[PDB]
Amino acid sequence: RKMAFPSGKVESCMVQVTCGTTTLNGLWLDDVVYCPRHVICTSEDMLNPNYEDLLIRKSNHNFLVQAGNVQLRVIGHSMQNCVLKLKVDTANPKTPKYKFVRIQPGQTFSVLACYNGSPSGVYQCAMRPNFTIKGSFLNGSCGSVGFNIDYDCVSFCYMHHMELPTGVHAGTDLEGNFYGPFVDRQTAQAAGTDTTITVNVLAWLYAAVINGDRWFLNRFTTTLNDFNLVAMKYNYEPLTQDHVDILGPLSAQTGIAVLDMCASLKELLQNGMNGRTILGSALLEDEFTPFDVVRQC
Amino acid sequence: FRKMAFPSGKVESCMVQVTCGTTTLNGLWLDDVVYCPRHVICTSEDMLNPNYEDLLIRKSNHNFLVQAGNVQLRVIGHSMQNCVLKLKVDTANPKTPKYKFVRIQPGQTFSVLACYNGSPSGVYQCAMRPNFTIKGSFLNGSCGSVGFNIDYDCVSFCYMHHMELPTGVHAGTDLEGNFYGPFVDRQTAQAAGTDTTITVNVLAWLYAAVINGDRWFLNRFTTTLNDFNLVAMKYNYEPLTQDHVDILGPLSAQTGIAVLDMCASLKELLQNGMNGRTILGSALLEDEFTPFDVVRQC
Numbered sequence: 060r061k062m063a064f065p066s067g068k069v070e071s072c073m074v075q076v077t078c079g080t081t082t083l084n085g086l087w088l089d090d091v092v093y094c095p096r097h098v099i100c101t102s103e104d105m106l107n108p109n110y111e112d113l114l115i116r117k118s119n120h121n122f123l124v125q126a127g128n129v130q131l132r133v134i135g136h137s138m139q140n141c142v143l144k145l146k147v148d149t150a151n152p153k154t155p156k157y158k159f160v161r162i163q164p165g166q167t168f169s170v171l172a173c174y175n176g177s178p179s180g181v182y183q184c185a186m187r188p189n190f191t192i193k194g195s196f197l198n199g200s201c202g203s204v205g206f207n208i209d210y211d212c213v214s215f216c217y218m219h220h221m222e223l224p225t226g227v228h229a230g231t232d233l234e235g236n237f238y239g240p241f242v243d244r245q246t247a248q249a250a251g252t253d254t255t256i257t258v259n260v261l262a263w264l265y266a267a268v269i270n271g272d273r274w275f276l277n278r279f280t281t282t283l284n285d286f287n288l289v290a291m292k293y294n295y296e297p298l299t300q301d302h303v304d305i306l307g308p309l310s311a312q313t314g315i316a317v318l319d320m321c322a323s324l325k326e327l328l329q330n331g332m333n334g335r336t337i338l339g340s341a342l343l344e345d346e347f348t349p350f351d352v353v354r355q356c
Numbered sequence: 357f358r359k360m361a362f363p364s365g366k367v368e369s370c371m372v373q374v375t376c377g378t379t380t381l382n383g384l385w386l387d388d389v390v391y392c393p394r395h396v397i398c399t400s401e402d403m404l405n406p407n408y409e410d411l412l413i414r415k416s417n418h419n420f421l422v423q424a425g426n427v428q429l430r431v432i433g434h435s436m437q438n439c440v441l442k443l444k445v446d447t448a449n450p451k452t453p454k455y456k457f458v459r460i461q462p463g464q465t466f467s468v469l470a471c472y473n474g475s476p477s478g479v480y481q482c483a484m485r486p487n488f489t490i491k492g493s494f495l496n497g498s499c500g501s502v503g504f505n506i507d508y509d510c511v512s513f514c515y516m517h518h519m520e521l522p523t524g525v526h527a528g529t530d531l532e533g534n535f536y537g538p539f540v541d542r543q544t545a546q547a548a549g550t551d552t553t554i555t556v557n558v559l560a561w562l563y564a565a566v567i568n569g570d571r572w573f574l575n576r577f578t579t580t581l582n583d584f585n586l587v588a589m590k591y592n593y594e595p596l597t598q599d600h601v602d603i604l605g606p607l608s609a610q611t612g613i614a615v616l617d618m619c620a621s622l623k624e625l626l627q628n629g630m631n632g633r634t635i636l637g638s639a640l641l642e643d644e645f646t647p648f649d650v651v652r653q654c
């Protein structure tokens with residue numbers, strides 16, 4: 060099932076940042092607070108703000124950073140693409156081991172949704188191929204982060220900025236770079252047309268096999284280039300070499316070649332399910348990575 | 357609209373590892389007591405059918421090996437409340453939250469924090485099914501994992517994991533050791549009563565889908581409460597009470613759709629199938645969101 064990482068290490072890092080009357084969420088790691096730069100906007104700013112000129116008018120004493128109602132004093136500020144970095148005078152004693160990472164489409168992560176620096180909920184998300192995520196966010200949620208946990212090291216990968224007219228969501232990595240062609244303006248932006256995450260559909264077929272559901276296994280094989288040409292015709296992502304490599308463990312475990320599996324999914328694409336389920340669903344599931352399959356299992 | 361768990365940090369600070377001999381599971385460390393399932397004291401040979409009390413009198417405090425991360429806690433006492441072992445230790449959990457022990461009623465949801473060897477591993481949302489099972493995600497060594505709700509800094513523990521049924525649904529107890537359902541902490545194959553679908557939750561979920569723009573299942577018809585329950589019972593859905601009607605008010609006030617209107621919508625879904633369409637991306641009528649879960653998310 061959809062399963063989030065335990066959130067306690069990220070929870071102890073959430074703070075709020077206020078400019079005038081705009082309060083977003085921030086991420087407090089060591090003695091730096093990271094938040095979306097549009098906190099320095101007010102209403103007339105937003106259509107096309109001048110973050111350069113807006114941040115010139117700013118001084119350290121304009122920034123109210125609070126862990127709860129305890130203020131942390133700002134001693135430096137700077138902009139790095141779309142994230143503001145506020146240097147504070149206290150190193151967060153609950154700073155976990157961590158890295159900032161830029162994820163690829165198809166990869167999953169947990170979102171800690173927060174409001175006023177207060178965690179509200181946790182859930183698993185997948186970065187769609189059009190660099191949106193299908194999240195759950197109200198107003199006040201900007202600055203909420205997404206993350207993975209590997210050996211109690213936290214890999215921060217997403218900071219939330221935007222809800223698109225289609226209800227899906229957009230944001231940056233922790234260096235302030237948007238995933239996708241989105242800009243942090245009060246603007247109706249359009250997502251690229253999404254596609255199905257092929258490497259994840261394959262992982263899910265392996266998990267079916269691991270569990271005894273293998274009727275779909277065929278006797279054929281394919282080249283990777285022939286599958287990628289047939290896959291794009293069904294709005295499926297083409298497979299990279301990195302995709303085949305992370306399918307490796309599930310391949311070895313089931314004994315099924317990655318490219319026989321590809322030839323098996325192709326059949327499911329040309330001929331459908333035939334009123335037959337796979338792991339209980341009538342639809343192919345594309346938001347479990349091979350890591351998520353191995354994670355449990 | 358996603359299935360959302362409560363932040364698990366408050367529970368993470370409480371999970372520990374409990375080992376007796378060659379069996380290990382998770383315990384819950386609040387104040388100066390560690391709570392764990394009682395079959396941790398069982399040998400392999402014992403687990404088929406053991407006398408738990410005589411198994412416990414023959415126990416020494418020093419045979420219990422409680423590890424909280426890297427520190428070993430010392431057991432200065434023990435007792436047994438139903439299927440839950442209470443291990444008094446010489447150290448109080450300094451990170452003990454405001455908490456309470458609650459017995460959940462069927463249809464209600466909670467967050468499960470899946471743990472292994474006392475280490476948290478995942479968190480997700482479950483519902484107490486009508487037949488007092490939960491459709492969990494649990495492996496070897498998950499026994500002692502807990503379910504809980506948080507309500508303004510207060511944690512309400514409602515479930516401790518014990519068992520996976522042959523059908524692959526799961527069973528356990530409240531934090532006073534009383535099983536949900538007719539299950540026992542024996543190593544035997546146990547079946548549950550026939551399960552049903554949580555009606556008021558499906559309706560909350562239909563209301564969720566309208567709030568997210570999905571409207572294709574709405575219709576102009578309406579129904580009486582009793583004529584809806586006749587059809588719901590026919591399809592193995594729980595009955596709808598007036599109380600359930602009232603709990604749904606906020607969603608019905610919010611969307612402009614009277615509850616008895618959404619029931620006519622659900623009745624037609626039950627009698628006509630979904631014709632290959634989808635609601636909030638699901639091919640199935642989802643019944644593990646309560647009205648409170650929808651309200652708090654939307």
Ligand SMILES: COc1cccc2[nH]c(C(=O)N[C@@H](CC(C)C)C(=O)N[C@@H](C[C@@H]3CCNC3=O)C(=O)COP(=O)(O)O)cc12
Pocket residue numbers: 081082097105196197198199200201202219220221222223224228243244245246247248
């Ligand atoms: C013409 O305008 C539009 C037209 C059509 C679609 C549009 N979409 C946005 C947008 O999304 N705008 C960002 C801010 C940008 C301008 C930097 C925003 O509203 N983000 C929210 C999260 C959002 C709100 C609810 N659910 C979320 O995901 C926060 O993170 C806290 O913002 P608040 O200060 O608390 O209101 C503007 C817009």
Ligand SMILES: COc1cccc2[nH]c(C(=O)N[C@@H](CC(C)C)C(=O)N[C@@H](C[C@@H]3CCNC3=O)C(=O)COP(=O)(O)O)cc12
Pocket residue numbers: 379380381395403494495496497498499500518519520521522526540541542543544545546
């Ligand atoms: C003939 O026997 C059977 C036949 C058919 C079905 C059966 N089902 C069970 C059962 O579920 N038994 C509990 C222990 C009893 C004594 C209450 C258990 O087996 N295991 C887990 C949780 C489980 C592990 C797999 N998924 C979970 O949810 C623990 O965590 C504690 O024990 P372990 O640490 O694994 O040794 C026995 C059985």
